[model samples]
Target: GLIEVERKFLPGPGTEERLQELGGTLEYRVTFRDTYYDTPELSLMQADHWLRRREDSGWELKCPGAAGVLGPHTEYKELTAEPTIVAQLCKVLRADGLGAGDVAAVLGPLGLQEVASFVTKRSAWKLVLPQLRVDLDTADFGYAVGEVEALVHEEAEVPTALEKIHRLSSMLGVPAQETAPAKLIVYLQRFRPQDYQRLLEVNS
Candidate 1:
């Protein structure tokens, strides 16, 4: 299980220009829809877990990181394999052997449903100096955000990964300590306000 260390920030003006100046290459541009699933009660989100199916990619579940510290960066253990994802969902939902089947098959038994769905246009960048991957995304609903991500194979590498993310953040002129809500969160607040408030109270 690889740990993904990511810091999301609002993109500043001239951010792409700065990336080009720093020799970051545009890897590719893509548009894809992401559909997120959760229990009707939002048990997954309340627990800081995320289960999503991407348009081209298959199912993915993001579990809270095992990293020891809570820094500005959000870390997650990403599960891409279906069997692994199914097992994890059952574990999180506390279902007995419901993991026996694929994600869709157990959805009803696990009480999970599609909660948020949106398409996004993204330009991915690759930075050579810091070895970072940057993604600038614009949701179909008109919200845009950028994320600096570093994938590490072990937990011990998290500190270095976080440092690189912030370093690139500054290079792109992002203000220090700036954070933005996830695209799904904004979507929920707009279209599913009642469910949004429920998750908010849990965080509160």
Candidate 2:
């Protein structure tokens, strides 16, 4: 599985200009909606797992990566293929005998339901040298953030990946404070307060 190493940050006015100075290329700007799915009891989220479908991209499950450091970053094992996601969901849910099928087909049997939805306008950028992707995003409900991300295929590579992300984050003027939480987490807290409380307790 490919691991995603990322750090979230609060973007400032000079963020883009700074990137430009560093020879970063603006990839593109686009808007898309993301719909997240979860069990009513918040089983998947309670375990630090995320399942969501984006407008153009299909289903993706973000599982907590097995390797990480006590740093202001997140590591997730990203699952894009439906069949593999299905099997992993079953394993996490502790449910058995669920046969292979598309994500939609197994939703009812697996007890997964739409938990939250939101739209985002994103500005994506690419930096070479050590290689990194920077994404600045604004959600429809009026929240914005930026992320420095790196992708690696092996656990052994996580340290190097984290280093690059941290280096780029500082270059982007990321605050010394802790990294921001994901947009989905913020959405739940604002729109689904009760659900957010339950999930928060479990996470703490």
Worst 10 residues of 1 by lDDT: 64-73
Report the C-alpha displacement of residue 12, candidate 1, in angstroms: 1.8
Q: What lDDT tens digits, residue by residue, belong to model 1 across residues 1-204?
A: 878899898887798889999999999999999999998889998778899999777889998885335742389989988888888888888888753647878788888899988999999998987378989999998889999999888888987898888888888888897898899998998999999898879877
| lDDT on C-alpha atoms for all candidate structures | 0.87, 0.87
Cα-based TM-score, every candidate: 0.94, 0.93
Q: Over all chains combined, what TM-score does candidate 2 have?
A: 0.93
- Cα lDDT over the full model 1: 0.87
